[PDB]
Ligand binder design. Structure first.
Ligand SMILES: Nc1ncnc2c1ncn2[C@@H]1O[C@H](COP(=O)(O)O)[C@@H](O)[C@H]1O
Ligand SMILES: Nc1ncnc2c1ncn2[C@@H]1O[C@H](COP(=O)(O)O)[C@@H](O)[C@H]1O
Ligand SMILES: Nc1ncnc2c1ncn2[C@@H]1O[C@H](COP(=O)(O)O)[C@@H](O)[C@H]1O
Ligand SMILES: Nc1ncnc2c1ncn2[C@@H]1O[C@H](COP(=O)(O)O)[C@@H](O)[C@H]1O
Ligand SMILES: [Cs+]
Ligand SMILES: [Cs+]
Ligand SMILES: [Cs+]
Ligand SMILES: [Cs+]
Ligand SMILES: [Cs+]
Ligand SMILES: [Cs+]
Lengths: 129, 131
């Protein structure tokens, strides 16, 4: 019923000072589509997100792939861990994103949810309609 | 509800001889996650697919992005244009992919369906639940 129950894994994240390639390596190594950029001082606070989609455009535009990742990162769209799952689903539909970052009431990184999680379960699909 | 009815765009494709960067440019230009690689002799026949996920690994492994795209591509997982939409959704789930290449009875490239198409419409979501 709620967001936290659909989380499969610990959050895949790097510090905000990470390079574009460093994010690319971390995404390939974990077989995920998005990486959360955490703050320097506080590794629990998500400051941005970087997707393979962002890296793809960096490749097409011929950016320095060893340059900083923050300039291609976006400000996180979030859902609470205590929120119902359909909120995460409609934010994805609304923002045309395939990920939502799950945080707690303190604003700390709990995990990341994917469109993959919501669509491939019959129990969820009937709720989201 | 059948795959051909959820098609809203002509297939984004390149010839199988395309480089990795040439695919990356095509993906960015069309704002899509996948590109279908078509045959040399017959551009209607899909021979492979390349996702931005594949390009991402190319970046991480420091491959020559001006090298050919075919070695980083995959054998196309297809669905018929006449097939019902739940079959396409079933293949995405089973094979852990977010795209399916829609072809016709002759095996020619009609279009490409995405997990984005199936999940962001209430009419479809309900039918995916009904089975
Ligand atoms: N940044 C992340 N941290 C932790 N788990 C993730 C992250 N991104 C995606 N996932 C999970 O890993 C699976 C595959 O990720 P994706 O290929 O990005 O959909 C999904 O079902 C998500 O639940
Ligand atoms: N939870 C999120 N918060 C902010 N931006 C996002 C989020 N998920 C995806 N994006 C952005 O949407 C684009 C592609 O996202 P995705 O569909 O997750 O690959 C990239 O430019 C991402 O930075
Ligand atoms: N290779 C392709 N050729 C034509 N249309 C596509 C292709 N890939 C995706 N689409 C469609 O265009 C949209 C692009 O989204 P996506 O590729 O999932 O980022 C999807 O909703 C599909 O309906
Ligand atoms: N229709 C398809 N047939 C074969 N492989 C695919 C298909 N769609 C995606 N893939 C592969 O699955 C991985 C993730 O693709 P995606 O998550 O759909 O961007 C990539 O390595 C793709 O090459
Ligand atoms: Cs940006
Ligand atoms: Cs609601
Ligand atoms: Cs929208
Ligand atoms: Cs977006
Ligand atoms: Cs149509
Ligand atoms: Cs491959």
């Amino acid at each position: 019923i709620r967001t936290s129950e659909l989380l499969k894994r610990p959050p895949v994240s790097l510090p905000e000072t990470a390079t574009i390639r460093e994010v690319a390596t971390e995404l390939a190594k974990n077989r995920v589509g998005l990486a959360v950029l955490t703050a320097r001082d506080n590794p629990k606070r998500p400051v941005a997100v970087v997707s393979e989609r962002d890296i793809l455009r960096a490749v097409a535009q011929r950016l320095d792939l060893d340059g900083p990742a923050m300039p291609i990162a976006n400000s996180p769209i979030t859902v609470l861990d205590t929120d119902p799952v359909h909120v995460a689903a409609e934010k994805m539909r609304r923002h045309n994103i395939r990920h939502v970052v799950v945080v707690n009431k303190n604003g700390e990184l709990v995990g990341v949810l994917s469109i993959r999680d919501l669509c491939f379960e019959r129990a969820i699909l009937l709720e989201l309609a």
